[PDB]
Amino acid sequence: MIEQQMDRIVKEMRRQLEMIDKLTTREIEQIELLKRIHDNLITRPV
Amino acid sequence: MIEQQMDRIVKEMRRQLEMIDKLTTREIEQIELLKRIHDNLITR
Amino acid sequence: MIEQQMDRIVKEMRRQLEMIDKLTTREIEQIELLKRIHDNLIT
Amino acid sequence: MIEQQMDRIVKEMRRQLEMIDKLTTREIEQIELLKRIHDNLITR
Amino acid sequence: MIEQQMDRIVKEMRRQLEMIDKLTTREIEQIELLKRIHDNL
Known part of the structure; x- marks a missing residue:
């Protein structure tokens, strides 16, 4: 699908976030x- | 599909920034x- | 409108950055x- | 291949995290x- | 420029890195x- 690599990265950006x-x-x-x-x-002016 | 996924990216790029x-x-x-x-x- | 959806990504990766x-x-x-x-x- | 560039993105992303x-x-x-x-x- | 918009993107990930x-x-x-x-x- 290649949304295969799209889903791993979502997940990533939410971790980053x-x-x-x-x-x-x-x-x-x-x-x-x-x-x-x-x-x-x-309070301690010294 | 792929286009649908890219938006989440955009929203996540805005919710991040x-x-x-x-x-x-x-x-x-x-x-x-x-x-x-x-x-x-x-002064001190 | 996919290659164009990236044109916003590049806009924002640069905005964020x-x-x-x-x-x-x-x-x-x-x-x-x-x-x-x-x-x-x-002192 | 474009699917391949993506591995560069995920990688560079984990380089961020x-x-x-x-x-x-x-x-x-x-x-x-x-x-x-x-x-x-x-304790001053 | 899909495959070419690919690198422009990976680029910002190194400059942001x-x-x-x-x-x-x-x-x-x-x-x-x-x-x-x-x-x-």
Whole structure:
């Protein structure tokens, strides 16, 4: 059929996409962390 | 058939690239935080 | 309209790719401030 | 053969994933280096 | 240009394989600019 190779690749791009997805969750976590670090430098003026 | 399959590809190419606009948004959030932290460093 | 459906793919592989550029364009800004942030090693 | 070029696409695609994997591995290392640093400043 | 639109496509997969590859060399600069900050405690 050659849709034989079309189906393997779909599946692929959705993997690529779900990794990106999860990678994004690691980008946002880094914010909650950068924010809690930009704030600790404020309370502790030293 | 083959044509039908290529669209899924197109939608997956848009739902992917779509995902990246979103990610580049976080990247910009971090950079502003970084700068906010650096200025709060010049002082102490 | 199949060879033509690819003409959109090429349009978008190039669109996406031009967006993965900005994400990279930004990655460097972060890596820059971190350099300035580093320096106040003794201050 | 055109069916054959496709194997170049699937391959090059797995060359993407095999990497987007390496990259996400780059990203977590940052989260752990930040969760740890925070906890450093947390004790002053 | 089916078979010819084939390579133009495979091409962008190698040039896009470069963007991610580099975008990665930068991500590594961040992490060692961060460990070069964590241990700094």
